[PDB]
Every structure is written in structure tokens, then in C-alpha cells.
Amino acid sequence: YTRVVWCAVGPEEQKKCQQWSQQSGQNVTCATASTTDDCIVLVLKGEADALNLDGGYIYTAGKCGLVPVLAENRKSSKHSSLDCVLRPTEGYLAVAVVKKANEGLTWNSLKDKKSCHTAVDRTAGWNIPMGLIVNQTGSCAFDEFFSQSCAPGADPKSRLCALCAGDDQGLDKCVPNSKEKYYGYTGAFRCLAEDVGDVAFVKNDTVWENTNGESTADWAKNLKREDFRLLCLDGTRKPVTEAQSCHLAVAPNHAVVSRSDRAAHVEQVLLHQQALFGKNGKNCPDKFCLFKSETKNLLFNDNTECLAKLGGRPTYEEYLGTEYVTAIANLKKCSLEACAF
Numbered sequence: 183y184t185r186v187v188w189c190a191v192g193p194e195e196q197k198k199c200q201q202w203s204q205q206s207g208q209n210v211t212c213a214t215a216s217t218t219d220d221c222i223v224l225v226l227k228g229e230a231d232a233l234n235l236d237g238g239y240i241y242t243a244g245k246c247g248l249v250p251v252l253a254e255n256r257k258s259s260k261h262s263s264l265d266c267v268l269r270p271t272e273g274y275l276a277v278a279v280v281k282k283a284n285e286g287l288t289w290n291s292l293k294d295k296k297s298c299h300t301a302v303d304r305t306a307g308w309n310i311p312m313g314l315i316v317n318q319t320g321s322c323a324f325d326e327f328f329s330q331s332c333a334p335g336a337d338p339k340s341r342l343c344a345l346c347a348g349d350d351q352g353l354d355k356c357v358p359n360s361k362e363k364y365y366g367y368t369g370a371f372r373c374l375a376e377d378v379g380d381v382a383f384v385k386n387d388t389v390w391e392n393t394n395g396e397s398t399a400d401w402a403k404n405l406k407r408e409d410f411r412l413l414c415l416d417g418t419r420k421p422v423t424e425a426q427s428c429h430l431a432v433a434p435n436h437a438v439v440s441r442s443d444r445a446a447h448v449e450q451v452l453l454h455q456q457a458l459f460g461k462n463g464k465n466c467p468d469k470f471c472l473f474k475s476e477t478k479n480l481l482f483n484d485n486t487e488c489l490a491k492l493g494g495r496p497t498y499e500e501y502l503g504t505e506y507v508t509a510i511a512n513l514k515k516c517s518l519e520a521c522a523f
């Protein structure tokens with residue numbers, strides 16, 4: 183049993199995975215697909231074992247029978263005595279971010295503006311904001327709400343992809359993987375930073391991690407936190423320090439999923455793999471770190487301190503929470519219970 187097949191989304195994740203594979207002595211090997219959905223299909227077919235997923239994708243995976251295994255745990259300030267692996271996860275803050283200089287833009291004036299989304303089907307980038315917008319407008323036409331968008335995974339010729347940029351060669355426009363310039367947390371924040379969009383749907387951490395010298399990347403080098411504002415549901419604008427009083431939702435952390443017949447073994451191997459290449463890993467600062475990919479968030483989020491045990495051996499619904507599961511199901515009616523594949 184002792185060989186885990188990890189699924190990588192896109193060529194950049196594939197490269198990192200290959201490095202991990204070499205360093206793990208082939209205890210981990212690599213399968214690769216173009217999209218997260220395609221990776222879930224590989225796992226369902228038994229052609230890969232596992233991958234780490236945003237909550238929106240956990241919903242897709244879970245409807246198809248895949249189970250949560252371990253969750254991303256970032257650094258916190260509660261349960262400080264417990265080991266990271268045993269410390270309870272605290273979830274992240276889904277936010278809507280704008281430029282301070284874009285004065286008078288509020289939650290209530292988002293119609294017909296330009297939006298930047300992590301990807302279709304993702305928690306902070308899509309399910310939360312679009313679910314909120316569908317409810318408030320009483321309309322399923324979320325594809326006509328914003329004048330233009332970058333929402334990787336949408337129809338490339340549609341307005342929802344109009345702001346996406348693709349790769350260096352301008353290939354792979356609006357593809358839901360790291361090849362797309364504006365993909366994921368960092369890509370969506372870049373879309374806002376460069377004024378391609380008026381609003382970015384990301385998480386609190388993303389803003390902090392890419393401002394005030396935290397990034398060094400060419401587009402982020404010079405970005406200041408005070409130049410950004412958060413949009414609150416009450417129509418107010420707040421500095422990015424008040425994320426706890428001005429968010430769209432609290433999201434369940436990204437988590438590893440696998441088939442239930444492989445979950446126990448995937449868990450065993452990963453706990454060992456992070457002991458070697460995780461935050462305080464025996465071979466991280468010397469050979470390879472599993473949670474570092476130059477602010478690109480490949481395979482895992484770069485802010486992951488460890489993968490933590492779940493406890494309560496939760497179903498995918500228990501992991502996501504009944505509050506969030508029903509929120510997706512209400513949004514999915516616009517696009518009742520079955521596997522998508």
C-alpha cells in the first residue's frame with residue numbers, strides 16, 4: 183500500500199510535485215491534470231490517491247464519495263500550547279477588496295463593475311460572493327452582474343473571462359490553474375492591484391501576504407495596505423485591519439481528500455512527509471519544503487504551518503458545515519443530489 187499518488191493541477195504544481203517525489207524517495211509520486219475537477223476524476227477512477235482542495239471543490243469531491251483526510255492549519259493565537267497537528271483549525275475570512283482610490287464603491291454599487299475571482303466553484307472567490315449576489319438580486323443571472331470578470335473556469339469567450347490574461351504567451355486564457363496570470367488567491371489580488379478589476383474576491387490573508395514588502399514579486403513589491411479597502415455587507419468600507427468585522431463569510435480551511443479505502447494510508451504518509459518537509463521539517467531549509475512555492479500557493483497554501491488531524495472523523499458535509507453546504511446547493515440551482523461526473 184505504501185505509495186501515494188498525488189494529483190497536481192497544471193504544469194507548475196506538477197514541477198513541485200516531481201521535486202517532492204524525488205525527495206520522498208518515491209513514497210509520493212505524481213499524477214497531473216489541467217483542472218481541479220479533472221484531478222478529482224483521476225482520484226475517483228483510482229488513478230491518483232489524493233490532493234488538497236478549496237472547500238468549493240471539497241463539495242464537488244464529496245458529492246462523488248471522496249472524504250476529508252487532513253486540513254490546512256495556518257498560524258493562530260488560540261490553543262497555543264497544543265501541537266499544530268492537534269490544534270483545531272480556525273477557518274479563513276472571505277473578503278471583498280477594492281482600491282482606496284476607488285472612492286464610493288461599496289457592496290451596494292457592485293453591479294456593472296469589473297470583478298476578479300480566484301476561480302469558478304471556489305469558496306471565497308465564487309461560492310460566497312456569487313451566492314450572496316444571487317440571493318440579493320433574486321436572480322440566477324450572476325453571469326450578467328459584473329460588466330467584465332476574470333473567473334477562471336468560465337466560458338473563455340464570455341464576459342466572465344474577459345479580464346483573464348492567460349500565460350506568458352497569452353495561452354490558456356481563463357483556465358482554472360496557475361498558468362492563468364490572474365488564477366487563485368494571488369492572481370485575483372493581482373487583478374485588483376493592477377486595476378484590471380474593481381473588486382477582488384479573496385481571503386484576508388491574501389491582502390496581508392502581498393503588501394508592505396511581504397511578497398517581493400514585481401507587481402506586489404510596491405503595494406501598500408492603506409491603498410486597499412474591504413467591502414462590508416452593510417455597505418460600509420473598512421481598512422484591511424478590520425477583517426474580523428468586515429468579511430463575507432468564514433470559510434472552512436483547504437483540506438486533503440481521498441477515497442475512503444485510501445484515507446488511512448494517505449494520512450499516515452502525509453504526517454510523515456510534513457515531519458520531513460513541513461514548516462519545522464527535518465529537511466525543509468536544507469533540501470525541500472512542502473509548504474513553500476514562492477507566493478504561488480502550489481499544491482498547498484504557502485501560509486500552511488501544518489496539515490492537522492480532523493477528529494470526529496467528519497463526513498464532507500460535517501467538515502464544510504451545514505451552513506456552507508446549503509449555501510452552495512442554493513447557488514447550484516442556477517447552473518438536486520448527484521455526482522457531477
Ligand SMILES: *[C@@H]1O[C@H](CO)[C@@H](O[C@@H]2O[C@H](CO)[C@@H](O[C@H]3O[C@H](CO)[C@@H](O)[C@H](O)[C@@H]3O)[C@H](O)[C@H]2NC(C)=O)[C@H](O)[C@H]1NC(C)=O
Pocket residue numbers: 309310313314317504505508509512
Ligand atoms: C441564499 O438564500 C438561501 C435561501 O434563503 C439561504 O439558504 C438558507 O440558509 C439558512 C441558514 O443557513 C437555512 O436556515 C436554517 O436555519 C437553522 C440554522 O441553525 C437550521 O436549524 C434550519 O434547519 C435551517 O436549515 C435555510 O434552510 C436555507 N434555505 C434554503 C431554502 O435552503 C442561503 O444561506 C443563502 N446563501 C448565502 C450565500 O447567504
Ligand SMILES: *[C@@H]1O[C@H](CO)[C@@H](O[C@@H]2O[C@H](CO)[C@@H](O[C@H]3O[C@H](CO)[C@@H](O)[C@H](O)[C@@H]3O)[C@H](O)[C@H]2NC(C)=O)[C@H](O)[C@H]1NC(C)=O
Pocket residue numbers: 257258259275386387388390391396423424425426
Ligand atoms: C489577516 O491575515 C493576516 C495574514 O495572515 C493576519 O496577520 C498575521 O497574524 C499572525 C497572528 O495571528 C501574526 O503573527 C505571527 O508573527 C509573530 C511574530 O511577528 C509570531 O509570534 C507568530 O507565531 C506568527 O507567526 C503574523 O505576523 C500576521 N501576518 C502578517 C504578515 O501580518 C491577520 O491576523 C488576519 N486578520 C484576521 C482578522 O484574522
Ligand SMILES: OC[C@H]1O[C@@H](O[C@@H]2[C@H](O)[C@@H](O)[C@H](O[C@H]3[C@H](O)[C@@H](O)[C@@H](O)O[C@@H]3CO)O[C@@H]2CO)[C@H](O)[C@@H](O)[C@@H]1O
Pocket residue numbers: 271272273274432433434435494496499500501502503504505506
Ligand atoms: O455544521 C455541522 C457540523 O459542523 C462541524 O463544524 C465544522 C467544520 O468541520 C469546520 O471546519 C468549520 O470551521 C469553520 C467554518 O469556517 C464555518 O463553519 C464557521 O462558521 O465556523 C468555523 C470557524 O469559526 O466549522 C464547522 C462548523 O461551523 C462539526 O465539526 C460537525 O461535528 C457538525 O456536524
Ligand SMILES: *[C@@H]1O[C@H](CO)[C@@H](O[C@@H]2O[C@H](CO)[C@@H](O)[C@H](O)[C@H]2NC(C)=O)[C@H](O)[C@H]1NC(C)=O
Pocket residue numbers: 184205206207209455
Ligand atoms: C518512505 O516510507 C518508508 C515506509 O514508511 C519509510 O521507512 C520507514 O521509516 C520509518 C520512520 O523513520 C520507520 O518507522 C520504519 O521502520 C520504516 N519502514 C520501512 C519498512 O522502511 C521511509 O522513511 C520513507 N522515506 C521517505 C524519505 O519519505
Ligand SMILES: [Fe+3]
Pocket residue numbers: 236237304305306433436
Ligand atoms: Fe479557498
Ligand SMILES: [Zn+2]
Pocket residue numbers: 429431432
Ligand atoms: Zn462573520
Ligand SMILES: [Zn+2]
Pocket residue numbers: 494495496497500
Ligand atoms: Zn460525524
